[PDB]
Ligand binder design. Structure first.
Ligand SMILES: COCC[C@@H]1CCCN1
Lengths: 6, 235, 235, 7
C-alpha cells in the first residue's frame, strides 16, 4: 500500500 | 559531529547544492549538522531535512525489498541451495537502513519535536517519527512489537494535535491520516482501524472542499484520492 | 580490510546481488575484495569490476559537473559573492572522485595488469587504466599534463596489443578505439586524430563483419554504431 | 561532452 509520496 | 565546525548557514547552502547534484546522502549529512546547531527550522528547512532522508531511506528500502525477494525465492519449490550470502547481504543493507532510521529518530527526539514552535511543525515532526518507526517495523522481527507501539503513539499524538489545530482539508493533516492508515493496515494488521481512519478523514475533508480556493481544492483532493486508492485496495 | 575474511566466491556472489539492487558502492567494494584474493579475474568477473566502478565514478562525475557549472556561474562577470561554500563542496566531491580513481588505478597496477598474458584481459585492463586517468584529467589543471600523458600511454599500449592480437570486430578492441578517440577529442585537443581513429576503426570493422555469427554481429555493430554517432557529432 | 563506451 502506498504512503504519501514526494 | 563532523559538521560541528561549519556555520549553520553554510550547511543549509550546501544542503541545497547537494540536492541540485542529487547527492542525497551529502544533503542529509548537511541537514543533520544544521539540526544539531540547536535552532528551530523554518518550513523550507524542515522540508530539506525530510526530502534528504526520504531519498536516502527510500533507496535503502528498495534495495532491502529486492534482496528480501531473492532470499524468499531461495527458500521455495524454486529449488537450488544458495548458501548464506543472500541473507548476509540482506542483513547488511538492513543494518544500514536501521542506522539511518535511528539517526532521524534521534534528531526528532533531540530536540526537534519539543522545540517545535507551532502546530504545523509539531505535526510534521511527529508524523516523521511515526514514519521512521514504521520503516524500522518493516524490517524488525522481535523488538517489532515495541517499534509498532512507538509508531502508533507518535502518529496518535500527531492526530490529536491536527484535529485540534488544523482544518480537515489541511494537506499536512491529510497526509498524516494517509500514512497512519497505511501503518494500521500494512504494519499493525489492523485493517478495521485503517479503513475507519481513511474513511473518516475522507468524509470530513469532503465537507469543506466548497470553501477552498482552486489551488487548495486541488491539493486536498489529490491526497483524498490517495486515501481513496487505499480504501479501494482494502475494501 | 573488511573483506579479508570472506570467501572469494561469496564476494563475487554478493557483487552480483549488489548489482541487482543497484548498490554500486557495495558492488565495487565486493569486487575489490575479490581482486585482493590474488587470483586472475574471469571475463565475467572483469565485467562486474568494470560496471561497479563505472557507476560509482559516473555518479561522482555527474555531481562534479553540476557543481563546477554552478561555481563558474558564481565566478561570472557582474556577480555578487556567496562565500567559499560552492568551491568547498566542489572540492569535496572532486577529492572523493580522485580517491575512487586512485583506488581503481591501484587495483590495476598492484593486482591486475600483467598477471594477464591473454590479449583479452591485457587490453581490457590497459583500456581501463586509460579511462581512469582520463577521469582524473577531466578535473585536473596542472599536473594535468602528466595525467594526460599517463592516459595516452595506457591507451596506446592497449591499441598496440589489440591491433596485433585481436580481430578488427572484437568488442574490446572497438570499445578501446571508441574511448581513445574520445580522449583525443575531449582531453588531448586532437579532434583530427579523434576523427581519423573513429573512421578507420569503423571501416576496418565493417569489412570484417561477414565473418561473424548473428549474436557477435550484434555485439560489434552496437559499438560501431556509437563510433558513427561520434563521427556524425564531430563532423 | 562526447559520449564514451556505455558498457
Ligand atoms: C573493455 O570493453 C567493455 C568495458 C565495460 C565492461 C562492462 C561493460 N563495458
Amino acid at each position: 500500500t502506498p504512503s504519501l509520496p514526494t | 559531529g563532523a559538521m560541528g565546525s561549519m556555520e549553520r548557514a553554510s550547511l543549509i547552502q550546501k544542503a541545497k547544492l547537494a540536492e541540485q547534484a542529487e547527492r542525497y546522502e551529502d544533503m542529509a549529512a548537511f541537514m543533520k549538522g544544521a539540526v544539531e546547531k540547536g535552532e528551530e527550522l523554518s518550513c523550507e528547512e524542515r522540508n530539506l531535512l525530510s526530502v534528504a532522508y526520504k531519498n536516502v531511506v527510500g533507496g535503502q528500502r528498495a534495495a532491502w525489498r529486492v534482496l528480501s525477494s531473492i532470499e524468499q525465492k531461495s527458500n521455495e519449490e524454486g529449488s537450488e541451495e544458495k548458501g548464506p550470502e543472500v541473507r548476509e547481504y540482506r542483513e547488511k543493507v538492513e543494518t544500514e537502513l536501521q542506522g539511518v532510521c535511528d539517526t532521524v529518530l534521534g534528531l526528532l527526539d533531540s530536540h526537534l519535536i519539543k522545540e517545535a514552535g507551532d502546530a504545523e511543525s509539531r505535526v510534521f515532526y511527529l508524523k516523521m517519527k511515526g514514519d521512521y518507526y514504521r520503516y524500522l517495523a518493516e524490517v524488525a522481527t522481535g523488538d517489532k512489537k515495541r517499534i509498532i507501539d512507538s509508531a502508533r503513539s507518535a502518529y496518535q499524538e500527531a492526530m490529536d494535535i491536527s484535529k485540534k489545530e488544523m482544518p480537515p482539508t489541511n494537506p499536512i493533516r491529510l497526509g498524516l491520516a494517509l500514512n497512519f492508515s497505511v501503518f494500521h493496515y500494512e504494519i499493525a494488521n489492523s485493517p478495521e482501524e485503517a479503513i475507519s481512519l481513511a474513511k473518516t478523514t475522507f468524509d470530513e475533508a469532503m465537507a469543506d472542499l466548497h470553501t477552498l480556493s482552486e489551488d487548495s481544492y486541488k491539493d486536498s483532493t489529490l491526497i483524498m484520492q490517495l486515501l481513496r486508492d487505499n480504501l479501494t485496495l482494502w475494501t
